[PDB]
């Protein structure tokens, strides 16, 4: 039965590789070498948050570019105020193993989850005056990697074993489950149109899903190790992938290619997070060498180096307005840069 | 500032006080981790102490414990193992009755798992407590079968004590770091409320050694 496979699979992969190889007239550097360099950029530490007592594993920015959420390895989940460094809420978790926090696009819900195979959703605006658990999401078999909001009624999650799911909140039942990977899935990002998103596997592969139907439309390869973070281009036609091979890459949707590889000979550590800046000119990437490098988008030249941490950087993000940059580490501190 | 800003900073100070109290309360509890090979004596080990991760909770002689179990995780181990850096000890269950069962020797798989857990770069400063579960089965199983099927290089008779010593020393041999960590290797089937006593002795010894290395002259 596998005898037909051992030829048809190879024929199909060759017929899908030959065209994309024959549509590779030039590169990104060859065309964008004429643009002027961005010059060295310097960023100082503006505010430092001193609340946690353990490692910090996640961070997310609210829509208003003022509020913040953090989830520490201890049973806590603190909501900060990025302008005055106060605390507005503090949530005690039922399980002490969390690996992702997410903030609603409106400002009324906060979701978390981790090794407990469940995704808890908390409600912030309540008549009583305290955070109360709303729904306990179940149906997964492995650890919970990352979760994101579409609206106040739907959520996309990235399981541990193979699956990524979409379910509504009124009924704790999965609406659509799509599986095409072979290995763990860690990171996912949502396109602005809310109709498409991409997920990064651990078998050196990234796929592009469809929210409405539930099929996989495109696939990309190229890395020699696992992928740990993905962020979309602001436009909505590209995304960057971080790996443990000590390199970042930039893919294109309509091209089905890889454009440029960002890797230096001095760096040998791993990459834990990646996020684009506004207008898609800078690419902030977290590193395991105790630093956070800043790269150029249309060129490989390295911009300034953002180094103010005593442990490895795990999560970072850029606000919607584009002013602030936040980084978290396995130390208790969470820094805000500008 | 306004009145609302002062109220907000008062709320922030209250939250900080509560968090400090919670950290101080939770800072004096022992954390452990059980790792096993397939279906081992873990089920009967957890009995005398009193989805995915399961938490077990008990106290003994004015000391507070907190035990985890991640046997039913079924994922890539090297990827979620970061979170257990702060554990005090690592309990390990090994079956002595699987030296003839094959599924590929079962005891050799247990040895490989012990090697991978012990020489991992994270747990380099943490002790290991080894439980040898089955006793009564070993007595009736040695008399009929030769132990050479599990380790051919052994030379000796078919008594009990030499076989037990050989198994214990071969398990203890794989520890490359002789100085930083120590192994204890207690037997079982004598639960008799004695296993909790052994765990208490081991944890108090490891905590006093950790304190001596941290602040003392060691």
């Amino acid at each position, epitope marked *: 039965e596998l005898d037909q496979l051992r030829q048809e699979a190879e024929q199909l992969k060759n017929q899908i590789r030959d065209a994309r190889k024959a549509c590779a007239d030039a590169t990104l550097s060859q065309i964008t070498n004429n643009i002027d360099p961005v010059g060295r950029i310097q960023m100082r530490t503006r505010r430092t948050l001193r609340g946690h007592l353990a490692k910090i594993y996640a961070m997310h920015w609210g829509t208003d570019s003022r*509020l913040l959420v953090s989830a520490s390895q201890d049973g806590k989940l603190i909501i900060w105020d990025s302008y005055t460094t*106060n605390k*507005v809420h503090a949530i005690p978790l039922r399980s002490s193993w969390v690996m992702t926090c997410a903030y609603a696009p409106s400002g009324n819900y906060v979701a978390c989850g981790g090794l407990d195979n469940i995704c808890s959703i908390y409600n912030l605006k309540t008549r009583e*005056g305290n955070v109360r658990v709303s729904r306990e999401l179940a149906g997964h078999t492995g650890y919970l990697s990352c979760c994101r909001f579409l609206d106040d009624n739907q959520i996309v999650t990235s399981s541990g074993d193979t699956t990524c799911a979409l379910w509504d909140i009124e009924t704790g039942q999965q609406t659509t489950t799509f599986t095409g990977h072979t290995g763990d899935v860690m990171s996912l990002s949502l396109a602005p149109d809310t109709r498409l998103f991409v997920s990064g596997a651990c078998d050196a592969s990234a796929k592009l899903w469809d929210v409405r139907e539930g099929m996989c439309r495109q696939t990309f390869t190229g890395h020699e190790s696992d992928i740990n973070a993905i962020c979309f281009f602001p436009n909505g036609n590209a995304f960057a992938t971080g790996s443990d091979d000590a390199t970042c890459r930039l893919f294109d949707l309509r091209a089905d290619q890889e454009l440029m590889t960002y890797s230096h000979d001095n760096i040998i550590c791993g990459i834990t997070s990646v996020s684009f800046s506004k207008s898609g000119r800078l690419l902030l990437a977290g590193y395991d060498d105790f630093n956070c490098n800043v790269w150029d988008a249309l060129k490989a030249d390295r911009a300034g180096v953002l180094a103010g941490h005593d442990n490895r950087v795990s999560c970072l993000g850029v606000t919607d307005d584009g002013m602030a940059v936040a980084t978290g580490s396995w130390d208790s501190f969470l820094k805000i840069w500008n | 500032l*306004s009145a*609302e800003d002062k*109220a*907000a900073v008062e709320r922030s100070k209250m939250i900080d006080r509560n968090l400090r109290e919670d950290g101080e309360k939770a800072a004096r509890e022992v954390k452990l981790l059980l790792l096993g090979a397939g279906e081992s004596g873990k089920s009967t080990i957890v009995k005398q102490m009193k989805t995915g991760i399961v938490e077990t909770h008990f106290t003994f002689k004015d000391l507070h414990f907190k035990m985890f179990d991640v046997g039913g995780q079924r994922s890539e181990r090297k990827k979620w193992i970061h979170c257990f850096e702060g554990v005090t000890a690592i309990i390990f269950c090994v079956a002595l009755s699987d030296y003839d069962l094959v599924l590929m020797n079962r005891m050799h798989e247990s040895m490989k798992l012990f090697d991978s857990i012990c020489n991992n770069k994270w747990f380099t400063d943490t002790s290991i407590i080894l439980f040898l579960n089955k006793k009564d089965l070993f007595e009736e199983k040695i008399k009929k079968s030769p132990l050479t099927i599990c380790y051919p290089e052994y030379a000796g008779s078919n008594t009990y004590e030499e076989a037990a010593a050989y198994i214990q020393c071969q398990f203890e041999d794989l520890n490359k770091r002789k100085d930083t960590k120590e192994i204890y290797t207690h037997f079982t089937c004598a639960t008799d409320t004695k296993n909790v006593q052994f765990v208490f002795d081991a944890v108090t010894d490891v905590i006093i050694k950790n304190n001596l290395k941290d602040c003392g002259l060691f």
Partner: single-chain antibody
Amino acid sequence: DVQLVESGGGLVQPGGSRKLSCSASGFAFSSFGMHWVRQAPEKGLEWVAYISSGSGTIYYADTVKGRFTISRDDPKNTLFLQMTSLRSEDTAMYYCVRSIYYYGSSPFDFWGQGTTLTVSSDIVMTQATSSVPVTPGESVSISCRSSKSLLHSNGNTYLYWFLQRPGQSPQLLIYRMSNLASGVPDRFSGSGSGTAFTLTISRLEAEDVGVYYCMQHLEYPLTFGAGTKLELK
């Protein structure tokens, strides 16, 4: 669901003493701050006392500096207010109030029911209007002025609005300039700036008859207005 009930008060000789009490019912009493608001038989709305979260900051009014004491006990979820020397200007309903303070909070959310006693410099909101005839199906506007400009350096004004129908307790309508509250219809709009503030409604119904008040929250001594009755001929 949320309920505040307060009781205890009769007739007192001019110089006696009595103690009030208010009991909570399931709203996480330990995380909020409470107030006390006074109202003579047919007058406006003064201010009496205050207690904060954790029994920290405790600020009183001007007239009642030396005869009132405010205290709370988190167990049993009750609040008290003692009295020592009472003159003939202490006959009023005392209207226990709730309040929470954070970045997006809504102070003065829930107002209690009230008791009854019969003993037998700062900002001044004018609100010169007293009574205006109204008819259903049209838009009316009420004006308010303040001595000091309320636009702080943070960028947000501090002045609220209230409604009180005849024979019950007040409720919050807009908890700043241009920030509508929950549980109130969306036919209201602040549209204020500087020192001349206003409030317009879309259509007037039979449930909107009552009195509207103003309140400032820059300086801690909270002053009030005088009222604006709608008669609805």
